[PDB]
Amino acid sequence: SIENLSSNKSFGGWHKQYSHVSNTLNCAMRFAIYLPPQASTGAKVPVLYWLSGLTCSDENFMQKAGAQRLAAELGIAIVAPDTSPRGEGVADDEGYDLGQGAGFYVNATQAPWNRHYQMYDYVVNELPELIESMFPVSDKRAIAGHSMGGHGALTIALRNPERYQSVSAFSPINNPVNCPWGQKAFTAYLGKDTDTWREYDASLLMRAAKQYVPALVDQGEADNFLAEQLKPEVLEAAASSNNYPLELRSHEGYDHSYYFIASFIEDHLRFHSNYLN
Numbered sequence: 001s002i003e004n005l006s007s008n009k010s011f012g013g014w015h016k017q018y019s020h021v022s023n024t025l026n027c028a029m030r031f032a033i034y035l036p037p038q039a040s041t042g043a044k045v046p047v048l049y050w051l052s053g054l055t056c057s058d059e060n061f062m063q064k065a066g067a068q069r070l071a072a073e074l075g076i077a078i079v080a081p082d083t084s085p086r087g088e089g090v091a092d093d094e095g096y097d098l099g100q101g102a103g104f105y106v107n108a109t110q111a112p113w114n115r116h117y118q119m120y121d122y123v124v125n126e127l128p129e130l131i132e133s134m135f136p137v138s139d140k141r142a143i144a145g146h147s148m149g150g151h152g153a154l155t156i157a158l159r160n161p162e163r164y165q166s167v168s169a170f171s172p173i174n175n176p177v178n179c180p181w182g183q184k185a186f187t188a189y190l191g192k193d194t195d196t197w198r199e200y201d202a203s204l205l206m207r208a209a210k211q212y213v214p215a216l217v218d219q220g221e222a223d224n225f226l227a228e229q230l231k232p233e234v235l236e237a238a239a240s241s242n243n244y245p246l247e248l249r250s251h252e253g254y255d256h257s258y259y260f261i262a263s264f265i266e267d268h269l270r271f272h273s274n275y276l277n
């Protein structure tokens with residue numbers, strides 16, 4: 001039911017990849033975890049769930065964000081699920097922005113996607129239960145993500161305020177119902193009734209929030225998707241209209257890539273550490 005696929009020592013801790021049979025997704029799923037040195041001592045550590053964006057697997061962040069050095073210093077485990085169900089038994093699309101590598105962290109209601117694309121239930125319910133039963137971790141968790149994953153982290157935190165201590169994102173899709181990436185995915189996964197899309201839009205959820213999770217968002221000003229897909233100003237508007245504890249930082253010259261993420265990921269870890277402990 002569970003297989004450890006790889007184990008790589010990293011800054012005194014361990015990066016480990018797993019495969020398991022997911023009950024929510026009804027298929028084999030891969031996730032990666034980074035266990036800091038503290039995990040080898042008997043201590044329990046907090047967990048930051050990291051949600052990746054379009055076309056990513058469970059490994060991109062682990063390999064490219066350079067989060068391990070500070071995670072090891074702070075004693076924080078990081079768990080990175082895949083971005084969709086995977087396999088020939090799972091529906092796909094030829095486009096980078098639909099299907100595999102593109103689950104959008106929603107529970108699909110439309111055929112043929114609904115058979116396996118239950119990524120919201122996976123990240124919110126199944127994965128944390130698995131993590132906490134396998135690893136020396138406490139029940140303190142936070143969540144973060146990039147782009148499609150930034151959309152994932154914000155929506156999931158906003159909808160589950162009592163479960164997450166803090167949330168952050170790089171370049172999130174803030175207002176998916178109003179951009180092509182979100183409209184294409186939601187139409188496919190959720191259908192044409194745009195009313196059902198509302199619970200999966202970070203900006204709408206932030207406007208509606210009754211409970212707050214402290215939020216940190218970083219956006220690169222040289223990000224080519226900023227105006228058409230991401231719309232940080234819409235998230236700022238939502239926050240201002242609902243007393244929301246959001247800090248949104250804009251960075252000149254920085255883009256959408258992991259070069260941007262790596263340049264600021266330490267701020268995120270320190271932010272999450274503040275609330276995890």
Ligand SMILES: [Br-]
Pocket residue numbers: 052053054146147148149
């Ligand atoms: Br993305």
